[PDB]
Design a binder for these strands. Structure first.
Ligand SMILES: Cn1cc([C@@H]2O[C@H](COP(=O)(O)OP(=O)(O)OP(=O)(O)O)[C@@H](O)[C@H]2O)c(N)nc1=O
Ligand SMILES: [Mg+2]
Ligand SMILES: [Zn+2]
Ligand SMILES: [Zn+2]
Lengths: 1052, 99, 74
DNA sequence: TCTCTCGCTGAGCCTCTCGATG
RNA sequence: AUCGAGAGG
DNA sequence: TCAGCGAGAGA
């Protein structure tokens, strides 16, 4: 029933129109009895009945006489809800100024006037503001603007022009807005409604009180003290001082603490004013409108369930019986088991057997949502089908843990229930766990087995020498299974088996081939779960973590989605089954210490001694033996580590048949490290080698290393030394989460409104792509950077008049292989930064969707995806570096500005992308360059005008790029001369605050100044972004709501 | 802990927030960001109106779920009205432009 | 309709419009009292609608002409 | 024009427990 | 219903 | 507290 929100300055007549009651002289509610006293802050007459349909005197109590005010007492009969709707006013006796328009760095109550802030304050402080009021009343704006316009041309100094333009702009805006002068000084005061500032009873007789009711009473009494003094005609000496006491009192109800000496109450803490109820983490915007508390929700601890399918979860029945109450009530009413709501409620409370079948049928095909609190990317919320269990904990699928960052050492989780058909269908179609298998940040799978599954599959596919059953010839995998389960053969025996496999013939038709193959028993047993269409060579080896991931990706590429989930579940079942049968364990004798260690250290201790002799007689600099000793110790540590690994990797020696041979060993620690299940090489170094060299808290290297490992323990000194690094790591982890969170919030705020709105914009510009080569080693090839982009122009072959690549083609895996067969050159691209679309981007300038594989669809919120994709690895790194990227994205001056001014958008694009990827790649994090380009495009959305041309302009006139482009396009067909403009570059924090919408800018931060500018300019909000519709409670213009909004513009 | 319906705060008529008080879970800004990245508009609109400070919508929704009709008609949250009243209290005119 | 919905996505074109068509078709069975075009098999209206869409019997332009027929009769 | 004081602005997310004072 | 003190992910 | 960036100083 509305389409826009309008903001402007208020007037005394409007304030009196808002009111229901006159000037409130009384101070107090009424402490003695419940009935409030009249004419005060709380009042039955002004704000309506205290109780529904009953007057204060009690003469009327019931409906049919409603709408008739009582005669004896004069009380209207209405529902009590009106007590949180109506307002009132206080009519003052002396005028007072408004602190917001005065207190600021660009003070705007004295910006129109030429008086400085100090002089204006001194006049206002009287060491009541009739001078200011009359000065603003008498001023004529039109003549001042006419004089200033002529004065601007005459001035030849750049410094003088800066202030003149600022004054002229403010004068013109104040004239065009419609707000009259002399309104920044108040003469009437509005009063907030009663039920939004209530008094809460306590266990004792006393009532808790709000800060606002104290400041209001203080203002009322200080203003009413002047009322009686006027009749008495007191000397002006007393009159002046009280006036100032009024000023500060008003400056208490408004923003407090902006002028020093903040008022306090019973305790030693400042009181919170009206300005404190709108800003900050505890204000309305960030605590009650962008987030809130909901119904139909629950919380519990999580445990692992190893028997579940990928689309299921385990839910306790005690929680479920209470989550789904209204559905149970409805179905109980349907079958006649109850005749009233109370009967159904009692029947559910005194639980019987009949209600459990009802609960079983209600949840048969109803999904639920599970969420873990930190919630870094969109995969932190998912949907599942619930299975009723016994107990109190929640059971979770082992394969979804890594995307949730969850482990079973005390984590908790929350659960929510959709209620409408649309919500259930959205949960099934968009958020189901079987839908999410590919990352949105890159093109890698998100489900991946680890730990016990990997170790089981690795052990299952290993190979030995002279094991039992070696040399047999088998009819197939079933014979291998039979022989192994009987006990006649080992899993590690080398045999010959007859295998049949299917392949794509020419059009997706499976064609079979049968042959004999040398393999092992375990590989043939595992072959029985592979889907039809894959080659046998993919399991005929030892299967590590990367091999299993490659298998899953190949199955997804060749055969699609439905076989992939079945394959994953079968792989998990097989891994869990075969890890238990091995009996893999860990013991103290698994950690083997090389025998030559006691030599390598000792000889090293000789060398360090020798240089000491060279220090007895002057032959080397005293600042040089440090480096030589450190190098000696590093070499010794390398020798010891190499000897340890050389002994550990081949520790098995085997008698084949009357002869000896070497083979890969079966030591538990070595297999755990090699398979990729748990444990890096450095940790094995620390366990069975040498602990190495430590560092001082400052950062220097302690000269003597730790020559012990964790098997043969440490002494007091080494253990004391090793605590500095641990404490420094823990402190670094504990204090740098907030930086990542703040950066993520800023990135989300700068790009929250970017949505795909078209298909092709028609532009022809773009970015040239070249491989990244620095120093001599190619850090980045010329293949992955152009995989999934769209060619801006035609690509020519390495010859005259030859076209190698068709235009507008979408490169996929087969196309990429065809290109790499004879790749000789590179391809240009179209970038979202160079897009002629107005208010959004077009699909072909974006590319493909990393989560799905095809072209991006209409209605995608790519800005939020980019922001999460960038912010997630920084936060996950916590629990150079982060300051470097925070300095780039804020456009900090050491320069990108000159890069843009000298080589176009390409210069800044390349600089920012390269300098961000350099930081992110050092930690081994993979993020596509699309998201950085999205953020950069958001970083440049303003233009500075120079030449007025035939269109309206104000010389400088920093304006929106899109609006200037639209004006130039409009003034082209008719025939005119356009304006001249230069492109600016802004930081994300500055770019967020300079937006056409003031609601979202106020939501971000710095509410007071944004609201001040909006009120003095008379701005209008059109509700076009995501945040505005979230705040008002409408469908967002993206996804399943997008078409809805497209209907709206079709209705006008 | 779990909840279906219960008591609401006095000014902003949103559910309370403690197990001792039989409160509901908090759906914060980051969860809103995740739902926006999914594109589930109707789920978000449910999360902001029918399970929250909208007063007539939740009553109608409960009656509809009892009757077997899974359909909602939302309205305007009360927190927006509170913010508008506070902005008016600060001496500033703010209005919903119906035209 | 069960476990996966990819076939219906291919048959309609994208997930966003598939959700809208599926909800519109499911509300007819749940509340308007309309019969299914497939064996019900103890399924809810959402999965029944998804199965009918996967079979090819339901799309947006079909629900247009079917409703136009009802208006002429009434 | 080019240094030097002078200042308000901002600082991750979700749960639980106690006492004292309203 | 704020203010201090701790605790868990 | 600690950066960061204006705003208002002047030689
Ligand atoms: C203390 N803290 C903790 C967390 C969350 O807690 C998870 C790890 O907590 P944890 O108990 O499972 O320990 P962890 O797995 O790392 O190591 P071990 O299991 O002991 O080997 C971590 O992902 C992080 O999201 C947070 N968001 N802010 C915090 O201030
Ligand atoms: Mg845990
Ligand atoms: Zn009366
Ligand atoms: Zn484009």
């Amino acid at each position: 029933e509305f389409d826009a929100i309008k903001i402007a300055l208020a007037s005394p007549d409007m304030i009196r129109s808002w009111s229901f009651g006159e000037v409130k002289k009384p101070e107090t509610i009424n402490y003695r009895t419940f009935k409030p006293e009249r004419d005060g802050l709380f009042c039955a007459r002004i704000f309506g009945p205290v109780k529904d349909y009953e007057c204060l005197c009690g003469k009327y109590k019931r409906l049919k006489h409603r709408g008739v005010i009582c005669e004896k007492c004069g009380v209207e009969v209405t529902q009590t809800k009106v007590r949180r709707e109506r307002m009132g006013h206080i009519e003052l006796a002396s005028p007072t100024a408004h602190i917001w328009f005065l207190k600021s760095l660009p003070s705007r109550i004295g910006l129109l006037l030429d008086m400085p802030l100090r002089d204006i304050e001194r006049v206002l402080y009287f060491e009541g503001a009739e001078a200011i009021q009359a000065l603003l009343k008498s001023m004529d704006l039109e003549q001042e603007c006419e004089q200033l316009r002529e004065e601007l041309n005459e001035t030849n100094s750049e410094t003088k022009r800066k202030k003149l333009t600022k004054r002229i702009k403010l004068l013109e805006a104040f004239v065009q807005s419609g707000n009259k002068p002399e309104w920044m000084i108040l003469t009437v005061l509005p009063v907030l409604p009663p039920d939004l500032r209530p008094l809460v009873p306590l266990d004792g007789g006393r009532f808790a009180t709000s800060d606002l009711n104290d400041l209001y009473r203080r203002v009322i009494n200080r203003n009413n003290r002047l009322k009686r003094l006027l009749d008495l005609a007191a000397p002006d000496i007393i009159v002046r001082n009280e006036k100032r006491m009024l000023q500060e009192a008003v400056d208490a109800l408004l923003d407090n603490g902006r002028r020093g000496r903040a008022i306090t109450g019973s305790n030693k803490r400042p009181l919170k004013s009206l300005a404190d109820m709108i800003k900050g983490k505890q204000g309305r915007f960030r605590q009650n409108l962008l987030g809130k508390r909901v119904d139909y929700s629950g919380r519990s601890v999580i445990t692992v369930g190893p028997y579940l399918r990928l689309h299921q979860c385990g839910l306790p029945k005690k929680m479920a019986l209470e989550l789904f109450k209204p559905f149970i009530y409805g179905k109980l009413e349907l079958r006649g088991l109850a005749t009233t709501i109370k009967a159904a409620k009692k029947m559910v409370e005194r639980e019987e057997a009949v209600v459990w079948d009802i609960l079983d049928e209600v949840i048969r095909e109803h999904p639920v949502l599970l969420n873990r609190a930190p919630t870094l990317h969109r995969l932190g919320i998912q949907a599942f089908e619930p299975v009723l269990i016994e107990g109190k904990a929640i059971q979770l699928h082992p394969l979804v843990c890594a995307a949730y960052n969850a482990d079973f050492d005390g984590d908790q989780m929350a659960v929510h229930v959709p209620l409408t058909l649309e919500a259930q269908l959205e949960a099934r179609a968009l958020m189901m766990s079987t839908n999410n298998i590919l990352s949105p940040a890159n093109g890698e799978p998100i489900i991946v087995p680890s730990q016990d599954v990997v170790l089981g599959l690795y052990y299952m596919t290993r190979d030995c020498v002279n094991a039992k059953g070696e040399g047999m010839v088998l009819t197939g995998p079933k014979e291998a299974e039979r022989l192994y389960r009987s006990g006649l053969a080992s899993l590690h025996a080398r045999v010959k088996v007859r295998i049949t496999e299917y392949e794509k013939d020419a059009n997706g038709e499976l064609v079979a081939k049968t042959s004999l193959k040398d393999t092992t028993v375990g590989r043939a047993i595992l072959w029985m779960i592979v889907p039809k269409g894959l080659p046998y060579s993919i399991v005929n080896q030892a299967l590590g973590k990367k091999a299993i991931s490659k298998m899953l990706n190949t199955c997804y590429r060749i055969l699609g989605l439905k076989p992939t989930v079945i394959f994953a579940d079968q792989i998990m079942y097989t891994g869990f089954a075969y890890a238990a049968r091995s009996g893999a364990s860990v013991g103290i004798d698994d950690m083997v210490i090389p025998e030559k260690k006691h030599e390598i250290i000792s000889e090293a201790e000789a060398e360090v001694a020798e240089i000491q002799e060279q220090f007895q007689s002057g032959l080397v600099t005293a600042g040089e033996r440090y480096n030589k000793v450190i190098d000696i110790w590093a070499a010794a540590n390398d020798r010891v580590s190499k000897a340890m690994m050389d002994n550990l990797q081949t520790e098995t020696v085997i008698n084949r048949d009357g002869q000896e041979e070497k083979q890969v060993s079966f030591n538990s620690i070595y297999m755990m490290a090699d398979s990729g299940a748990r444990g890096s090489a450095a940790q094995i170094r620390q366990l069975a080698g040498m602990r190495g060299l430590m560092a001082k808290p400052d950062g220097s290297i302690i000269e003597t290393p730790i020559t012990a490992n964790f098997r043969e323990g440490l002494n007091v000194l080494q253990y004391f030394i090793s605590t500095h690094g641990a404490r420094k790591g823990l402190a670094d982890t504990a204090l740098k989460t907030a930086n990542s969170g703040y950066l993520t919030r800023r990135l989300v705020d700068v790009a929250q409104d970017l949505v795909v709105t078209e298909d092709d914009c028609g532009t022809h510009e773009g970015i040239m792509m070249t491989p990244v080569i620095e120093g001599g080693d190619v850090k980045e090839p010329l293949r992955d950077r152009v995989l999934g982009r769209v060619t801006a122009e035609d690509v020519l072959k390495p010859g005259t008049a030859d076209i190698l690549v068709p235009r507008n083609t979408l490169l996929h895996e087969q196309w990429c292989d065809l290109l790499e067969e004879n790749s000789v050159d590179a391809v240009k691209v179209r970038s979202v930064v160079s897009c002629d679309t107005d208010f959004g981007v077009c699909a072909h300038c974006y590319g493909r969707d990393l989560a799905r594989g095809h072209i991006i669809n209409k209605g995608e919120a790519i800005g939020v995806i980019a922001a999460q994709s960038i912010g997630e690895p920084g936060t996950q790194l916590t629990m150079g570096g982060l300051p470097r990227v925070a300095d780039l994205f804020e456009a900090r001056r050491p320069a990108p500005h000159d890069i843009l001014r000298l080589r176009g958008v390409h210069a800044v694009t390349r600089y920012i992308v390269n300098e961000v990827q350099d930081v992110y790649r050092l930690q081994g994090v993979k993020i596509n360059d699309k998201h950085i380009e999205v953020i950069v495009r958001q970083m440049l959305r303003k233009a500075t005008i120079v030449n007025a041309g035939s269109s309206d302009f104000l010389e400088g006139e920093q304006v929106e790029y899109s609006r200037v482009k639209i004006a130039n396009r409009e003034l082209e067909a008719n025939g005119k001369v356009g304006a001249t403009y230069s492109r600016d570059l802004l930081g994300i924090t500055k770019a967020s605050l300079a937006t056409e919408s003031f609601i979202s800018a106020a939501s971000f931060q710095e509410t007071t100044r944004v609201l001040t500018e909006a009120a003095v300019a008379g701005k209008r909000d059109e509700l076009r972004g995501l945040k505005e519709n979230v705040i008002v409670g409408r469908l967002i213009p993206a996804g399943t709501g997008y078409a809805y909004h497209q209907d709206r513009m079709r209705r006008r | 802990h779990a909840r279906s319906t219960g008591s609401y705060s006095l000014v902003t008529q949103q559910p309370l927030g403690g197990k001792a008080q039989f409160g509901g879970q908090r759906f914060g800004e980051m969860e809103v960001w995740a739902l926006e990245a999914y594109g589930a508009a109707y789920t978000l609109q449910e999360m902001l109106t029918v399970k929250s400070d909208d007063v007539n919508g939740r009553t109608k929704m409960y009656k509809n779920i009892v009757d077997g009709n899974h359909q909602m008609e939302p309205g305007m949250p009360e927190s927006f009205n509170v913010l508008l009243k506070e902005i008016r209290s600060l001496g500033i005119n703010i209005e919903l432009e119906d035209e | 309709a069960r476990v996966t919905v990819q076939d219906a996505v291919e048959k309609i074109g994208n997930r966003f419009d598939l959700v809208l068509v599926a909800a519109r078709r499911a509300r007819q069975m749940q509340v308007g009292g309309k019969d299914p075009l497939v064996p019900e098999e103890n399924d809810k209206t959402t999965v029944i609608a998804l199965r009918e869409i996967e079979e090819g019997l339901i799309n947006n332009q079909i629900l247009d002409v079917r409703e136009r027929q009802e208006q002429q009769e009434q």
